[PDB]
Amino acid sequence: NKRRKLKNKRRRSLPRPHDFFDAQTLDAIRHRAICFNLS
Amino acid sequence: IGTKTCRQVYEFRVKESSIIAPAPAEDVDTPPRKKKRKHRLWAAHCRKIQLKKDGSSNHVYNYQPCDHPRQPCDSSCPCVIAQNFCEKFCQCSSECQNRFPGCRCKAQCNTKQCPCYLAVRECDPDLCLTCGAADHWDSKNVSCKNCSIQRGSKKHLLLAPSDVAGWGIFIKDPVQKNEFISEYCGEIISQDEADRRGKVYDKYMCSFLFNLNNDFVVDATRKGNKIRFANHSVNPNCYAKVMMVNGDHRIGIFAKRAIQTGEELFFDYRYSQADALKYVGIEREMEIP
Amino acid sequence: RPKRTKASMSEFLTYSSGHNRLYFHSDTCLPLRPQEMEVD
Amino acid sequence: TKAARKSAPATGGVKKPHRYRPGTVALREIRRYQKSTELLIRKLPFQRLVREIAQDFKTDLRFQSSAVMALQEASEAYLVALFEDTNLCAIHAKRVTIMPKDIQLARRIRGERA
Numbered sequence A: 001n002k003r004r005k006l007k008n009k010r011r012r013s014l015p016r017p018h019d020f021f022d023a024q025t026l027d028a029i030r031h032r033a034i035c036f037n038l039s
Numbered sequence B: 001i002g003t004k005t006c007r008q009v010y011e012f013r014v015k016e017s018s019i020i021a022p023a024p025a026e027d028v029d030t031p032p033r034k035k036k037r038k039h040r041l042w043a044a045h046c047r048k049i050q051l052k053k054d055g056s057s058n059h060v061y062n063y064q065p066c067d068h069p070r071q072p073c074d075s076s077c078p079c080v081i082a083q084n085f086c087e088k089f090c091q092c093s094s095e096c097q098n099r100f101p102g103c104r105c106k107a108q109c110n111t112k113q114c115p116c117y118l119a120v121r122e123c124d125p126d127l128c129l130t131c132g133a134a135d136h137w138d139s140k141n142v143s144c145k146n147c148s149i150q151r152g153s154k155k156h157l158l159l160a161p162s163d164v165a166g167w168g169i170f171i172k173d174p175v176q177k178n179e180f181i182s183e184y185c186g187e188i189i190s191q192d193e194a195d196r197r198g199k200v201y202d203k204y205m206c207s208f209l210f211n212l213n214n215d216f217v218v219d220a221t222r223k224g225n226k227i228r229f230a231n232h233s234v235n236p237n238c239y240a241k242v243m244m245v246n247g248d249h250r251i252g253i254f255a256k257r258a259i260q261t262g263e264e265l266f267f268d269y270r271y272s273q274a275d276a277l278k279y280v281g282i283e284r285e286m287e288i289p
Numbered sequence C: 001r002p003k004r005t006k007a008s009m010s011e012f013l014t015y016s017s018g019h020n021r022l023y024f025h026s027d028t029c030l031p032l033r034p035q036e037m038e039v040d
Numbered sequence D: 001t002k003a004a005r006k007s008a009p010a011t012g013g014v015k016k017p018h019r020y021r022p023g024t025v026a027l028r029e030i031r032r033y034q035k036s037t038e039l040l041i042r043k044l045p046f047q048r049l050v051r052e053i054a055q056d057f058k059t060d061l062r063f064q065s066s067a068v069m070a071l072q073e074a075s076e077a078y079l080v081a082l083f084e085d086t087n088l089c090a091i092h093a094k095r096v097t098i099m100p101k102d103i104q105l106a107r108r109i110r111g112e113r114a
């Protein structure tokens, strides 16, 4: 396709594809960074 | 039977012939011997039926075996009333002027010229003689492309959560256009029950119902095969066309265009636009410019 | 080919192939491993 | 109170009768006759046609069964040649169908008209 545009040609709306990140590890990283910031 | 020898059985039949009335043992040849039966008359006979009521092309009556024990294939034939052709199972004689003639095309019963592909009739195993319909029915490959549904030779579809919505149906291999895909099999049910059950599914938004003909409906919620999870699209790579095979209407599925490995299958539901947004309002494709 | 267009304020307001996603067992909604894309 | 039924477009085509384009039967006709030696006029109509024309020249004519064939060859032999030359006038008109004004032309060139 010579007229092919940028990568955004997929859809206007879609269901969520689910996130790979977890909430519990965010708290551990936060507290890990909290003590890291304290030093 | 090895218990008795032919003697005293031949003699028993002598006793049986003296007791039971003799069999008729009558043979017939019919007044017609050959000729006077050109298939253009059949097409003319079909033309007569076509202009009478098949012009509407909306009242699809499923085949019913008509009984003509003594009467000829008159206009009182139930198939004639049902604007349909008699079949090999019809009680109409072997000279019934409604039965499909055959599928004699030399290359294969698959293209526009062939009467099978243009008509509703999937080519009979005993009729599409040139396309190898009866030949090597065990062998998967054959010249014809209008007997896979007869053989049941589907494709190897895949199940995975469709990106558009929920479950869908994927394909492991490339497939070309205008060729057989897996058949949307299901359950035979009448209209009235279909609306009652559909009312339940309409409440639950499910639509595993398919308008087989005006006389029967096929539903895929409780019982079915994989392809019932195919999603709808307004311009899908695959389409749906009712076929008519061996006296049972079914719905064949075929890809509109050339397909490669791993493409998700879609087909048009043919619902109203109001019902389209009511049910299938997701299409997932904008305009490029 | 990268466009490499000239920087400008007005500039502002995926050739996939093969398989992409995992497929599940059609019979039982179970995860189907890639080792049986054929007997399945 | 009708549920939304997933439908498919229905079709009802049948075998279309086949008609040869006009004039293409003719070429098929010509060659099977130019390769055919038999008489082109029914055998008996002459035996009741000539026994009538001759009746006016003299009365009570008992024909001989072979002679009736002898005329029956000439009439065909006279006509066939005339049509062959008739076509030559027709094609000379740039038309392709013969017309009764060409038989009368092609009969004056030969000299039978006088």
Ligand SMILES: Nc1ncnc2c1ncn2[C@@H]1O[C@H](CSCC[C@H](N)C(=O)O)[C@@H](O)[C@H]1O
Pocket (backbone or CB within 6 Å): B162, B164, B165, B166, B167, B168, B205, B206, B207, B208, B229, B230, B231, B232, B233, B278, B279, B280, B281, B282, B283
């Ligand atoms: N393209 C589409 N957009 C939104 N809904 C659709 C759709 N195609 C089919 N549907 C809906 O999906 C229902 C079939 S059940 C399949 C739904 C979905 N694929 C899943 O697995 O969860 C139908 O009742 C229809 O209303």
